[PDB]
């Protein structure tokens, strides 16, 4: 049971004299404050305000603003004098099997309201963690009580939900933000917090977070307290990501000199920077499409690199896979250059 006093204590929890909760400093309160997914919140208002709210399936990458959004809709639809009596918010953190479906949800969905007459709502967080038969019971509960209560399933991956549960609900994908619109918010927080960031550090922040607001705040805040100024080298060293200069030098070694010297240099750089072969493969793949190669050379490199990345997954010798990565470039681009 329980697992609710921690969040209630956590909401007004800060040292307030030394700590700087940058992520919790700027939070939307209603649907008119979260300036993102304007189509989604507009059609959610259009569904609620005309008394035709359907079963909702909110999914997407985490940190996109799903739980706070549906909290805003639940608070704007139901007043605080009737909120707890007819809104039931559960999740898969409290799991003792599948009893929660035939217990709290089945009891809540099958009874009328207590104080103020209306329709009730069930919030279900991380619904992808449920088992298949738990979803098979949930879809029956939704099917036979669709008039009385509506359901809102908040999941991370849509592929873990059975097709019938997806069939009962309309789906809303919370995609990553166009990196451009994120910038105004970053200029806002740097103007508020009086920090020194160049445009290259801005580019680093928008390419590391991949459209996530919280991770951007975390990285910016951490680099600010670590150094006091943020450029690409400073954020990438604090993050421990493959630097663009390091990947460019790795590519230069694999394109220019022979097998043995490049292999020794890459091994030295990997032990020096704590670099894995997986992240090297990711950054080199990103470098492949920004470097002017012939189409056959690009096809060969992509096929070989995908094969190496598959081979790394099963737990092979990383040294031999590094040699194969060097070999993939030595087969084509070195003799193309030497011609």
């Amino acid at each position: 049971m329980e697992t609710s006093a921690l969040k209630q204590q956590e909401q007004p929890a800060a040292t307030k004299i030394r700590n700087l909760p940058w992520v919790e400093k700027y939070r939307p309160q209603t649907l008119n404050d979260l300036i993102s997914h304007q189509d989604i919140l507009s059609t959610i208002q259009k569904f609620i305000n005309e008394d035709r709210l359907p079963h909702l399936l909110l999914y997407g990458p985490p940190g996109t603003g799903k739980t706070s959004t549906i909290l805003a809709c639940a608070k704007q639809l139901y007043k605080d004098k009737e909120f707890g009596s007819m809104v039931l918010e559960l999740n898969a953190s409290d799991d003792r099997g599948i009893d929660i479906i035939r217990g709290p949800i089945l009891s809540f969905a099958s009874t009328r309201t207590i104080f103020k007459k209306g329709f009730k709502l069930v919030i279900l967080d991380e619904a992808d963690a449920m088992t298949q038969d738990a979803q098979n019971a949930l879809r029956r509960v939704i099917e036979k009580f669709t008039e009385n209560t509506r359901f809102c399933l908040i999941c991370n991956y849509l592929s873990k939900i059975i097709p019938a549960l997806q069939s009962r609900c309309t789906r809303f994908r919370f995609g990553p933000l166009t990196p451009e619109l994120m910038v105004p918010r970053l200029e806002h927080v740097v103007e508020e917090e009086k920090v020194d960031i160049s445009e290259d550090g801005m580019k680093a922040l928008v390419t590391l977070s991949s459209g996530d607001m919280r991770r951007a705040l975390n990285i910016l805040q951490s680099t600010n307290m670590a150094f006091g100024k943020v450029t690409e080298e400073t954020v990438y060293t604090c993050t421990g990501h493959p630097l663009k200069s390091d990947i460019a030098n790795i590519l230069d070694w694999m394109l220019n000199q022979d097998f043995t010297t490049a292999y020794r240099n890459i091994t030295e750089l990997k032990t020096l920077k704590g670099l894995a072969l997986h992240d090297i493969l990711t950054e080199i793949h990103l470098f492949v499409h920004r470097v002017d190669f012939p189409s056959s050379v690009r096809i060969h490199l992509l096929t070989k690199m995908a094969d190496i990345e598959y081979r790394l997954s099963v737990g092979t010798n990383e040294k031999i896979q590094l040699s194969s990565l060097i070999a993939a470039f030595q087969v084509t681009r070195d003799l193309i250059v030497a011609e």
Binding site: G97, I98, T131, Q132, D133
Partner: protein
């Protein structure tokens, strides 16, 4: 014929199968076991398939 049956070996090895083969015993034509009786307990599986 050889190309077809190479393709079929490709399907059997390098493609995902619907039912997980040799799930409780080993592969076909084995002597050590194969007497995998079904479940006898009322608790659910709680699997992540």
């Amino acid at each position: 014929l050889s190309e077809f049956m190479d393709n079929m070996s490709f399907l059997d090895a390098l493609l995902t199968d619907v039912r997980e083969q040799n799930k409780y015993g080993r592969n076909d034509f084995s002597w050590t076991n194969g007497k995998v009786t079904s479940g006898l307990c009322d608790e659910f599986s709680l699997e992540s398939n």
